[PDB]
Amino acid sequence: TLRAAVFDLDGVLALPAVFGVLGRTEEALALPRGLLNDAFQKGGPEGATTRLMKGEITLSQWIPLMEENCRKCSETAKVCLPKNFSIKEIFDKAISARKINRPMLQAALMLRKKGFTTAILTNTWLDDRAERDGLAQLMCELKMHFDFLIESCQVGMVKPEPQIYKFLLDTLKASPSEVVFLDDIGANLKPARDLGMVTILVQDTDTALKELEKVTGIQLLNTPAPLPTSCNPSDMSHGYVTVKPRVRLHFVELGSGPAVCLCHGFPESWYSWRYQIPALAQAGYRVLAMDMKGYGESSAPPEIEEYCMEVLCKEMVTFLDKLGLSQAVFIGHDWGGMLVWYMALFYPERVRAVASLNTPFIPANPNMSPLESIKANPVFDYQLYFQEPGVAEAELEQNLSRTFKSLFRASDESVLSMHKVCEAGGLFVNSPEEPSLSRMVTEEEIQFYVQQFKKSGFRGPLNWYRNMERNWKWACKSLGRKILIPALMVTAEKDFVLVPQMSQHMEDWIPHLKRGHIEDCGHWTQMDKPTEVNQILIKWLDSDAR
Amino acid sequence: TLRAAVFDLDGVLALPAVFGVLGRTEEALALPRGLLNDAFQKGGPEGATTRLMKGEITLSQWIPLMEENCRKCSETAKVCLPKNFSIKEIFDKAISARKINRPMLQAALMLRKKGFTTAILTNTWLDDRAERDGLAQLMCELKMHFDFLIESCQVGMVKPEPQIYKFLLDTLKASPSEVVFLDDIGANLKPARDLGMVTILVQDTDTALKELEKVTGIQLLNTPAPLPTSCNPSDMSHGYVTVKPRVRLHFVELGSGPAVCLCHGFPESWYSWRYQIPALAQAGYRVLAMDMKGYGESSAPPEIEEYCMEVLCKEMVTFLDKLGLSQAVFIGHDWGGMLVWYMALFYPERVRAVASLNTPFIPANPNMSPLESIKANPVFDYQLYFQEPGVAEAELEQNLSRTFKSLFRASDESVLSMHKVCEAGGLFVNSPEEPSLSRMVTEEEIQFYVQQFKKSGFRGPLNWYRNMERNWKWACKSLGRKILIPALMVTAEKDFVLVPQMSQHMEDWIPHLKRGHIEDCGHWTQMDKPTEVNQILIKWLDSDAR
């Protein structure tokens, strides 16, 4: 019975294989067959390549030793090398062309999901080239998906030496019969088989995956499209900034590059962006996923005034000041989407770009109170139930597991009546006390929001709805302005409160506005349609946020 | 008696003044005198400019309204504007050319240092231009040096309206007689005087500073070169990363741009880099100032093995992995300098560039034990006193205020005998129990290290010296390698343990090595010579770290 899966890098988890380049270069240069390959592994276990793979020497030290081997190999075939020839130039293109083998990673991901201990066992070098970052980015992306990464240059052992295999078994804490081993080199595959491990010679991915699916008894090939990588809270970098004597902001941070500040809605968390954080960091951005004031590890002062848009926006400006950020792109959902449009209206110099999920930008009516305006549309009736301090808190805090299971549901899973919330007298009137688990979330994920909301409850979050007159008066100062910095509006087809139709006149205030629309998507955009959210934002960031 | 100082931005804290550009453009274009200036403030308190300054409209909305005013002003002088003319193009150059008025900032810095409440009162706009970042960077640098920043567009009031002055007094919580007011515009200066405030018409900086020095009774002009901006711990962004079940790393983070990871020595803190963090962030880098394992808010497991170079280097690689950083430039001092050379030797793909302050790179002698090697040089005798667990801890932890006051001293302030530490029997044998305060530190700064060291004491820090055999064996694996990635060696003239001479053969292992040397500098490089450290690193980062 199998319990662990081992994968080589070059030719297995990454294609095209770097080995293949030595050969296709000889074909491209009408050079003798296997000339560059023979020069490569010249000397065997005593040769320059073995020393490089054991970590005795770095890649830049090996480059000249290899050129001398290429010199000698052409000398013993009675032929000569070209003028515009460089080993450095060949390997540079070879390493750069080498991309992740997505289906092979998907299969590794599925095996780990089903309880398998996963590992990478590769013959590699200490890369000190000026362009080593490309490969560093590849390894950093891959490694985080496996329990272990064993590198020949870090262990001073190499494939096919039997010591590295015994080392692999010891680190895996498993017997050979419990191990599947994938390699594109038969010679390197042999000792694993010889030790009693299950082996798969990887030539083409599809066949190798057929072999793997058969031996594990797990469907890996033709399996449904997987969800984007999520976040394990305890594996994240957690950031803390004091924005004023009693107010501290918490955020999760991942990646390098232009700063992207993610702003959640009500009643959410930084965790509501869990499927976006790895995707955006991977796309070349420095993601700062906030716990908005009143939420999670952020301060939650009791006073209503602490939650008016003006103070929330000022504190986010302070957040940037203390972190030393002149700008960040602001991406908001629900209440965060409202904040984000006001960040763009009142502080354009601090906003590189602005994007909103579901929340439209509707200017204030100076000729009507926001409380009268709410009346006009019975969809917002629940907001009047939220006005009285303590009322909604008591109902929402009473059973947290019930609160989040009832709320976080797809468009076809509705369990709550948000209409006539005033009349029925309560948000959970004819709602199950123990609702079913939505297809959007796991029990573990709901339990994350439960633990988060145990610190300060619903007062701070509900206070965001308790400053409509303040916000209205404040918004009225911007009634002569336009949003002229890059902007994106993302509509969700099946959001029954923030309906796409509410965004229709936005172009009158944001003329160069870009759009995105998500079919069959509910209010909880990020968890309902993660793949498409990431696709829309990554595409917009690369075109509009540099 | 004076207690507050107020400064305008344009023409006061930032030069050349943007006003001046309208006029020198007319001269450059042989246009009628004051044409562009008259078109600028056309309409008075009802005009386009007033609306922009009150925040009714953004800069991009004002640009076309201004072009129409330029149209009408040329029409009433019977002349015509050029072909290659653009108001946008003029203001862009004007805002970009405008730099901080360093002596004026220095004077503001000195006034705040002497108990003055400081503030900026400017007539400004909501900048939504594609190039608004330049100005955002200017304001973000400046604002952090003042208690308050009052912007006309944020307050909906403007200079010279008397309401803004009464607003300024209320925010300053001071009476007019307690306020000095600096402005380059007489009209805007007038109401402050009219209210009873002390005023200074700023034409040239020197004269204005003479006027200011006279009225405050504080030397501001010709004053000594100031220390670089430091860090207030409670105003920093604090980061926390779990690198393994029982090990968490803490860091302070500031700025955007290429990641620069700062690694302190023994017995230090992230705070030891306090004069570098704002300087490097300001130079366009994302500074991550570490609390190294065993220090401050970072984990301090008791076991000696947890502090061998191999594990410390592996954990820093994990630190990068969890933060989503493919690389960072590694800058180390003392023990951090040792780590940093081993980061470059064992993980070149993760090191964009490496720099060491004082610590040279000396390869391991495979033919001699590091304990024998230590014997050979009696300068390292204190390291043998550090070997026995508990001994040095008891002495160093006994009086923390005494430990740091005795240690953190300039080259001419020596209070300790590090020679024959073995014989005398103790590190503090003939040392004062209450040493004088070094000219390098304040009581407040020593008290920071005291509070930091109260959490886990000296075991973890001293454990860094307790793995010489492990480190020696590990280092010996790199004996065939070279450091070929960008590298900087910074020597300190008066470091009596890490003498410049120890770095002499480094070029044999680091051929493209760059150097820096600091005259009259002790061991505590960062606090001894902050200005020159920042100058050497900023210059090296811009040439070698992109």
Ligand SMILES: O=C(NC[C@H]1COc2ccccc2O1)c1ccc2c(c1)N(Cc1cccc(Cl)c1)C(=O)CS2
């Ligand atoms: O309140 C919401 N949005 C916040 C701001 C954004 O700016 C606005 C701009 C325009 C209008 C309103 C604006 O309100 C909101 C939005 C959509 C939905 C929704 C709530 N609810 C109700 C709910 C949610 C959580 C807990 C409870 Cl008890 C009840 C759903 O369950 C899913 S649909």
Ligand SMILES: O=C(NC[C@H]1COc2ccccc2O1)c1ccc2c(c1)N(Cc1cccc(Cl)c1)C(=O)CS2
């Ligand atoms: O130990 C030091 N360096 C760490 C590594 C770096 O890698 C190395 C590479 C080569 C040699 C040694 C290496 O050692 C060190 C260095 C300089 C000085 C110094 C200590 N001391 C002694 C001291 C400091 C703190 C507390 C106490 Cl009780 C005593 C001073 O007071 C100022 S001069």
